[PDB]
C-alpha cells in the first residue's frame, strides 16, 4: 500500500509563520488529500494536494491563526484523503500560543556613587529577535525605599531603542534601585554606595580552588597601589580552618578550635610575600572541620603605618577529573557501526591530551573492553560493531581507570566523574542503515556546512532498480526551517555509498538545531537518525566595534570604527574594564539575549502531549518528532506498538567613558574620533544596534588600552593658611621594561616660596617597576587658588642609566600635572549686606550706602560688589542652590533648597517670564531636593528631622513637606504614595477637637516662630493644607478650623496673631481676619516708610543699614505680608501697605537671596513671590546711576528682557560712600555686599565655648600625629533651651578626623548626625541646655604642614545666627 506522512510543529506561535509538510509514497493518482486546521472560530484548509506517480514531498507555509483564549488555544489538525473507493480521516491536537516578548534593560554601569548621572536603555524584542517599536505606557524609577522618584509617560522608541537618563542627588539614598517598564512587569536593578576609597589593594594571586591531594600550597599575597606600583610593608597572614558548625546539641560539648597556620613576612620589590602552607596542619578529611580554608592577610605600610586587609575563602574539592559523551545519541542501529567520541578533562577542565581512557561495554552477550587515547582537543573517538549485540540494550561507561579506588571510609574520597550512556535500539522492520556524520566544535553561523550521510540499502526491502527517495528535515527552536529530498538511483552508486548535504546555519536556527533524515520502504518500514548541532549564538545584524589604534596615550585622539547594517541605529557603551569585571552579571551578551526566551523547549506541550492510553485497571520514528517539537500524522510503520503492563575586591568604578547613540549610514560603516581619557586603565567597549531590516545585533567586547609610559602622583594638602609651610610630595613611576632618565621640574612661580632653591635640579635614573620620590618645602605666600605645575619628562641622556643608555620612547615624553591648592586667609570671613528697593515712579529715587571698615582687618580679604536686578526675587533666582550658606543636612534644612524654588516658578509662570532654559534648570533642582528629603521619610509615611535616627515622625515637618510636594506636582513628578502616606499618618494624629498633637514637638520656639500651646501647630497644619489647594470642606481643614475659632478669641502672642491672620485669609472668614489684622496694626513698628513687626523690644530708632536679620522678625513680617496678599481683590491702599512691608523684608537679604536660616528664608521668599506675582509690571527702561568719591561711576540698564539677569560688578575703589540714583519707570532691586576677614572675637554672650587638647607625642617626628580634641559647650542665653545646634569644627591645615570619628560621637549625648566636610566637621546636637556638654574625638595628620595657624571652633543656634560663640585652638607642640 502507498504511504503518506503529514508533519507540522506541535507549538504554533501567533506572530510566527509555520510550515506543514506532506510526504507521499507513490500510488495516489486517484486519491486527493486535504489537511485542515480546525479551531473554535474557523476551519482553515491548510494543504490541499493530490498524489503523483512518484514520491514527492510537498510542503506549504501558512500564517498561524489567532488563539481564541487570547493567550493560548488547543486546535485540531485534521488530515482527510478522499478517492474513488478510499475514504479515511485522522485528527491530532496542536497548541497555538502567543509569542513572548523579551525586554531587556541595560544600565551604563551596575554600581554608581551618588551624584553620578545614570544612563540606561530599554528595547523590547520578540523571539525572532526583531525590535518592537510600540509605545510604553509607563517607565518609572524606584529608590531603595521604593518611592517613585521619576517617571516618563508614553515613551516612543527610536528604532526600538529608548534612551533615558537620570541625575542622582549628591547624597542620594543608598542601596538598590529599580527601573520599571510597562506597569512593573519587566524590570532591572542597580546599586548605589560610596566608594573609590582604597589607596592600595591587597591581592591574593595564587589562591584558587584546592584539592586534598596537595601536600602544601603557596599562598601568594601581592600588595600594589591603585595606580599599580608596588608597596613596601610588613605582611601578616592568618590561614585557618574553622570547626564545622553542627546542628546537634549535647551537654558539655564545645566547638573545636580553629586549626590555623599564621605566617608573617615582608614584600619584595614586586610587592609580594609568598610562603608554602603544609596541608598536614588542617584536617583534610574529618566532618568535624569545614571544607574551606580562610586566609586573612593584613599589611601595614613601611613608614606610614597605613594598614589594609584582605580575605579570600578557598573551598577544597576532591574531584580530579571529568568525562562526558559528546557527538552521541541515546539510540543505535543494529548490525551497523555506532561511532562516537569521549571528551576527557582534568580537575581544571583542561583537555587531557594522549590520555589513556577505558571504554567499558555492558551487554547481554558479555562485558567487553576497549582502550582509547585522546587527541589535542581532549577527544577520544571510538567505533563499535553492533553486529554481535543481537539487537539488545547496551549500557556504555567511560572510565579513567579500570580497578576501583581503595580509600579509608572515614576519609573524604577523590573520585573520577565517569560518563554513562544508555542505548535503546531503533526498531526497524527493514535491514537497511542511515547514519549521519556530526560536525566538530560550536559551528560558525552563516557559513555553509557540508554534512556527510552514510547509507546502506538491503535488497530485501527495495528492488535494486527502484529509485530511493530520502526525505530530510531541519528543525530550529521547535519550528520547521528547511526541508528537501535527495533522490538516489540504485544503479549509479550501487547498494553501498554516501551523499552530502549543503547546510547553512542562520540565527533562526537554534543554538541547538535538529536534523532528522528518514526514508520509507514499500514494506512500510522506516529507518531514521537524529543529530543535534552546536551553533554560535548569532544575529542577522552584523555589528562590529573597533578602535584605531587599539593602544593610545591618555589625552590623545583615537578613531572608533563602528559597523552594522545600513539604516541601523547603534547604542555604544564604553566602560572601565573594572566595571565589567566586578559584576559579570547579565551584562548584554549573546547568551543573555537568547537567555530571555525559552528556546530549550523542544518537546510536546502538556496540553497536546500525546500519551499512550493503557487500560490500567486496579525509541522509534514517533519519538524523534516528539523530541523536536513536531507533531506527526502517518500510516506507515512509524511507532512501536504500545506494551502496557506497568562580586570581588578587584578595582574601582570610574567614569563610563562613552554612551551615545549612533546611526549607521548607507555605507554600513561609521568612524568618529574620541579623546582618550587621562586615567591609565584598559577600557572595554561594546555596541548593540537595531535595524527594522535586519533585527537586533550585538558586537564583540573590544578593548582600548590607555597606556602612558610613566605616571606621576601629587600628594598635596587641600587647604593651607598663609605663612605655613607644607610638604608637596611628588612620586614618579616607571611602567616600562627599560631604565629611563627622568628629570622632574617644579615650575617656578612668584606665588609661593621654595626652601629647596637651587638644590631641586638633578636627573635621577629610574629602572623597571621602580619609583623615585620628590619632595618640596613650600612656604605659602599668595592667597587664593595657586596652581602647582610639575613637568616631569624623559631626557635623551647618555649617562649610565641602568648599565646601558637611558631609554627614550617615541611617544609620551613629557607628563605635566597641575593641581591647585587653596591658601585661605587667617580668621573668619565676615559679610555685610545693605539691600535696597528703589522704585523710580518717573522721578529720580536715591539712597546712600557708606562702606565703613573696622580696624583689625586681616590683609587682602577686602572685596565688595553691587548686585542689580529688575526683579525683587532675582537675587534668589541666581542662587536657588545657595540660598543660605549653612549645612542643610536635616529633614527641614534640606527644604531650604526645595520650597523657594516652587514659589519662584509659580511667580514666573503667572507672570509669564518662565523660559524653557529657566524651567529646565529649576526642574532639575527640585529633583535633587526630592531625593534628599526622602531619606527623612519614615516607614509610616511621616517625616522627621533626621529620618529613622529619630524614633518617630514630626507633626510640623510632615505638614511642611506635604505642603511642598503637592505644589511640586505642577512642575516635576512626585509619587502620590508619599503624599497619601503623609496624609494617612497625619489624619491619625488629628486630635478630637480638630487640633493636631505635636508628635516630635512643634519644633523650636524660634524655628516654629512660636510656642504657647498645641493650637500653634493647629494653625500651621491647616495653613499648609489650604496652600496645597485643599477644600474648606476637607475633614482635616474643617475640624482644624473648628479648633481655631474659640482660641482666636483670647490670643495674645504676636506671632500667633500673624499666623492666624494668614489662615483665615485662606479660609475666607474675613470677619476674623480683620479682627486679627487690626491687632497687628496696633503692634506694627514703622521705621521710615518701612512697616514690620517684632517680638523683640523696640530699638531706639536707628536701624543699621547693614543686615542684622532677626530670624524671629523676618519670618514674622512675611506672615503678615502673606495675610495681606490673600484678599482676592486689592485696593491701592492695601497694595501700598504691602509695599511698605516690602521695603523692610527686601532690606534684610544676604548676598544670595536668602536671610538667616531655614523657615525665614522660605517664608519670606514665599511672601515676596506672592507680592511680585501681584505687583508685576513689565519695566520699560530703568537707568541706574552709581557714584563714588575717587572718580568711579557705573550705569546699568534694566528692560523687560533682562529683568531676571544677574548683573554684578565689583568696586575697584576702596571702601567709601556710594549713592544710588534710580531713574525711569519700574522697580529695580539693588544690593550692596561687603566682605572682610577679622580675627574671631571670643564672644560668650549666648553660648559658652572652650576646647581642651589631648596629649600628642610631640617628641615623635616619624609618627602620623594624632590630636585628641575635647570640646565643652553650654547655652547661657536668655531662654531655657536653645534650638538645634551646630558645632562647626574647622580643621587644622593637614589634619583630618580619624576612622570611627562618626561612630564615636553618635553614641555620645544629644548627637543626631555627624558630618565630615572638606576642611570643616559639622556636628548636629538636638538642643543645648544650660548644662555643660562635653564632646571628644581624635584627629590625625595626613599631610605635614608646619607653622600652623589657628583654626576656628564655632558653636551657634541654627535658627538664630545672632546667638553664637567663637573660639580658636592651636598646635600645642608649636
Ligand atoms: C508583544 O508585543 C506585541 C507588539 O506590540 C503585542 O501586540 C500588540 O498588542 C496591542 C494591544 O493588545 C495591539 O493593539 C490593539 O489593536 C486592536 C486591533 O487588533 C485594537 O482593537 C486595540 O484597541 C489595540 O489598540 C496590537 O495590534 C498588537 N500588535 C500586533 C502586531 O499584533 C503583544 O501583545 C505582546 N505580547 C505580549 C505577550 O506581551
Ligand atoms: C578590614 O578592615 C576594615 C576597616 O578597618 C574592618 O571594618 C571595620 O570593622 C569594625 C568592627 O566591626 C567596625 O566598627 C564597628 O562599627 C559599628 C557600627 O558600624 C559600631 O557599633 C561598633 O562599636 C564598631 O565600632 C568598622 O565600622 C568597620 N569599618 C569599615 C570601614 O567598614 C573590617 O572588619 C576588616 N575585616 C577583616 C576581615 O579584618
Ligand atoms: C558570543 O559572542 C562571542 C563574541 O563576543 C563569541 O566569541 C567567539 O569565541 C570563539 C571561541 O573562542 C572564537 O572562535 C574562533 O574563531 C576563529 C576565526 O577567527 C577560528 O579559527 C576558531 O576555530 C574559533 O572558531 C571567536 O573568535 C570569538 N569571537 C567571535 C566574534 O565570534 C562566542 O562564541 C559567542 N558565544 C556563543 C555561545 O555563540
Ligand atoms: C590653573 O590651571 C587650570 C588648568 O588645569 C586653568 O584652567 C584653564 O583656564 C583656561 C582659560 O583660558 C581654559 O581655556 C579655555 O577654557 C574655556 C572655558 O571652558 C573654553 O571655552 C576654551 O575653549 C579654552 O579651553 C582651560 O580649559 C582651563 N582648564 C581647566 C582644566 O579648567 C586655571 O585657570 C588655572 N588657574 C590659575 C589660578 O592659574
Ligand atoms: C620647611 O621650612 C620650615 C621653615 O620654618 C621648617 O620649619 C619646616 O620644618 C620645613 N619643612 C620641611 C618638610 O622641610
Ligand atoms: C509611625 O506612625 C505610627 C502611627 O500611625 C506609630 O505607631 C509608629 O510608631 C510610627 N513609626 C515610626 C517608625 O515613626
Numbering used by the authors: 20 to 637, 669 to 696, 727 to 1454
Pull text from the paper.
Human alpha-2 macroglobulin-like 1 (A2ML1) is a monomeric member of the A2M superfamily (A2MF) of protease inhibitors and complement factors. The functional inhibitory unit of A2ML1 is a monomer that depends on covalent binding of the protease (mediated by A2ML1’s thioester) to achieve inhibition. A2MF protease inhibitors utilize a unique trapping mechanism that pseudo-inhibits proteases regardless of their catalytic class. Trapped proteases remain catalytically active but are prevented from cleaving protein substrates through steric hindrance imposed by the inhibitor following a proteolytically triggered conformational change.
Structures of native A2ML1 were determined by X-ray crystallography and cryo-EM at resolutions of 4.4 and 3.1 Å, respectively. An initial crystallographic map was obtained by molecular replacement with a map excised from an early stage cryo-EM map with a resolution of 3.8 Å. Density modification with 70% solvent and two-fold averaging resulted in an outstanding electron density for the X-ray structure in many regions despite the resolution. Overall, the cryo-EM and X-ray structures are very similar with an overall root mean square deviation (RMSD) of 2.0 Å for the entire molecule. Multiple regions in the α-helical TE domain appeared to have better electron density in the X-ray structure than in the EM map, and the Gln1175-Glu1188 loop could only be modeled in this map. These differences in loop flexibility are likely to be an effect of crystal packing interactions involving the TE domain. While the CTM8 body shows minor overall differences between the X-ray and the EM structures, the orientations of the MG3 and MG4 domains within the MG-ring differ significantly due to crystal packing interactions. In both the EM and the X-ray structures of native A2ML1, it is not possible to model residues His696-Asp726, suggesting substantial flexibility of the intact bait region in accordance with its accessibility toward proteases. However, in both structures, it is evident that the strictly conserved residues Arg730-Pro734 pass through the same narrow opening that houses the Nt-α′ in complement A2MF proteins.
